[PDB]
Design a protein around this ligand. Structure first.
Ligand code: HEM
Ligand code: HEM
Lengths: 394, 394
């Protein structure tokens, strides 16, 4: 007798388990047990992943319901799971989305300047350098302070919440509440701070005092700052980190992008497609009985949309493990999700990675791992897959 | 068909696998495969562990031999594996051992002052605090700068080598050589630096210019600094970290030691006994055919002495998983090894932990984990078991 198949399969973010393709072929929707002991349906084909993400009867909001089968414990208040819904209902969606595009004057130059400064500092100190802690994450943190309009010096303290805030835990996490409450207080102060006039928090600060938003809660305004800083930083920092591993492990690709930087956007799109940064399937709760492939999912059941299931599906992306810069369907991956909850920061996440990579390849054209790849230490029980340190030489 | 049992069994340092007791009972010396693919004999009973460690025909030195079956790749030059032998042959053993006792005037006060400052800073910043990165390791690093006679400001840079230097890798590690060569150059400079007159490096500096040591190599003098700083810091920092977890998970014990600090030495001895800080068995190479239990180990074969095998052996330590402050054989554990290569820093390691714990319990009598224990992230492919961060509240 064996136990019900457990998820997640592996915290390693440098390779997809052979098991994923076997599951996709044999049983692209199948029952699994999550870290809480709850049962769930793991969906691993491109077709079924899209189906689930595009049917709102598979609800994000309802995953926060008391007594629901859980992927993991909430690390935010239950109402915050519906954060984008709350933003939309408040009439704030357009303004929030506009503030977090890479289009603001000076933003891309700021990114390039920041990347180059970080890289110059690594070069001065000499190899080995840690490209996560001393490049990708600092670049992500600087970017999000700029986007939010908050002081760069405040970034580190907000950043330090994230190793707990984005845990994927069987049980509630006391420290997550301590940090959440503290970071909310910080964002509340920012909204009352007359120095903060630019970026997302500058715009929210103004809308908060506009009559069209007088009955929008101060809690929501602060929540938007905490959730967008944390989500953006953890997502961009983690993605860039694991993309750099993928790049470094492909010297031919590294050289091509170095020689022809105009190909970096197409390269970043493939790096997004093959990215293993999301450690768990995206959770949804069925609000009706719904047929998904050979399974009738029942109302109240948990469904997990495995992004790498979709993104390595050879039926949609032939030779799925290979980076090919000339695919006919390059942005059709699910790295940013799909449907109602499609990532609002997709353009910014793309630009962060594109600029970081462009800068790294110019400054460190000889970049390579400084340790055998197996020596990377993969963070466990976390909502992202990331190496604790990424040691390189050049 | 299953593969030959692989070591190590688990990188988790908060619990011993049930498998260890099963092995000890069934086959206290048995064949295993190491991360390099080499075969080895894993020894897991107190009796057989002692036998191997007390028979120099199971050689430390010879583990560095070209073509030997390997636990892992060397991270130091092969001659450095015989570092203590080299120290003894140079006539330096007594002086080195004397410099690294906790007995030097002011040393214990320095430790207490340092621990208390670190803890005051955590208290000021507010919970959660990371007791590894912001307590145990800094305390270890400060201690070793003081013991060596080198500036406190140089500690951080030396410390940063250690996440690579003490890797347990299948393959050689380029960064380990970069850092080793750099740290050797630093220690060489220290020996030539007239400001350095105290501690181990002050004493070595003087002996180096004494006629009785004129033909001792500059390489050996520098090597002693690098190996004692790194080994001491990684050993004490890692031990204290995992001891604090053991303590925190036993509130009754925490309270007893808080109420009766005179029991802290006995508590630290039990924490040493149950400690899972060594990630791999201690390696030795057979230089003869030697009977160990039911196995005739052949000349040239690798033997791995599993410390927790010995230390959780109920035949030697009844109710082995329980901390009991009144055992009749409390220091008879193998936490510091046994025989020819018994730890020269044992007294200093004991004092570091005793003082760190004393200070922590006085300042933070309410100390507890701030995350569920399963959320700790255990460093992999490393010579020690340690959580990447240790989040606490108080
Ligand atoms: C490469 C970088 C990024 C990746 C791969 C990524 C990935 C994703 C994914 C997969 C989702 C879907 C969640 C779901 O459907 O369950 C999502 C949604 C979301 N993302 Fe991103 N993200 C990135 C960057 C960002 C940035 C820069 C921000 C904001 C500054 C951001 C904020 C959000 C928010 C607030 C949601 C929730 C959308 C909703 O619930 O409707 N992300 N992201
Ligand atoms: C709680 C703290 C410590 C623990 C648990 C510990 C553990 C050990 C163990 C198990 C060995 C035996 C290695 C073997 O036989 O294969 C050893 C040896 C050694 N230890 Fe420690 N150690 C600690 C602290 C220190 C300190 C503070 C120093 C120096 C400042 C140090 C330096 C060394 C050295 C140089 C050896 C090699 C001995 C030889 O090869 O003959 N250790 N230690």
């Amino acid at each position: 007798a064996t136990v019900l198949l457990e998820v997640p399969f592996s915290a390693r973010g440098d390779r997809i388990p052979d098991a994923v393709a076997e599951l996709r072929t044999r049983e692209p929707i199948r029952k699994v047990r999550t870290i809480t002991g709850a049962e769930a349906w793991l969906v691993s084909s491109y077709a079924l992943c899209t189906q689930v993400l595009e049917d709102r009867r598979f609800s994000m909001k309802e995953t926060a319901a008391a007594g629901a089968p859980r992927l993991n414990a909430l690390t935010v208040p239950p109402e915050v799971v519906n954060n984008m819904g709350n933003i939309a209902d408040a009439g704030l969606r357009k303004a929030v989305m506009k503030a977090i595009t890479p289009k603001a004057p000076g933003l891309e130059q700021f990114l390039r300047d920041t990347a180059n400064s970080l890289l110059d500092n690594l070069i001065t100190e000499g190899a080995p350098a840690d490209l996560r802690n001393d490049f990708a994450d600092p670049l992500a943190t600087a970017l999000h302070c700029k986007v939010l309009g908050i002081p760069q010096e405040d970034g580190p303290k907000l950043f330090r919440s994230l190793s707990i805030a984005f845990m994927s835990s069987a049980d509630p996490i006391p420290a997550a509440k301590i940090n959440w409450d503290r970071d909310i207080e910080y964002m509340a102060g920012i909204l009352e701070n007359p120095n903060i006039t630019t970026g997302l928090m500058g715009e929210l600060s103004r809308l908060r005092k506009d009559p069209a938003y007088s009955h929008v809660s101060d809690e929501l305004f602060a929540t938007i700052g905490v959730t967008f800083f944390g989500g953006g930083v953890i997502s961009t920092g983690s993605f860039l980190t694991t993309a750099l591993i993928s790049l470094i492990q492909r010297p031919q690709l590294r050289n091509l992008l170095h020689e022809k930087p105009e190909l970096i956007p197409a390269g970043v799109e493939e790096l997004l497609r093959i990215n293993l940064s999301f450690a768990d399937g995206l959770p949804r709760l069925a609000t009706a009985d719904i047929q998904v492939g050979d399974v009738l999912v029942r109302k109240g059941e948990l469904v997990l949309v495995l992004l790498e299931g979709a993104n390595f599906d050879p039926e949609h992306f032939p030779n799925p493990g290979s980076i090919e810069l000339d695919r006919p369907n390059p942005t059709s991956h699910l790295a940013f999700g799909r449907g109602q909850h499609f990532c609002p920061g997709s353009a910014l996440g793309r630009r962060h990675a594109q600029i970081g990579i462009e800068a790294l390849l110019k400054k460190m054209p000889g970049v390579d791992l400084a340790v055998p790849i197996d020596q990377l230490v993969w963070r466990t029980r976390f909502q992202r897959r990331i190496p604790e340190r990424l040691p390189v030489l050049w």
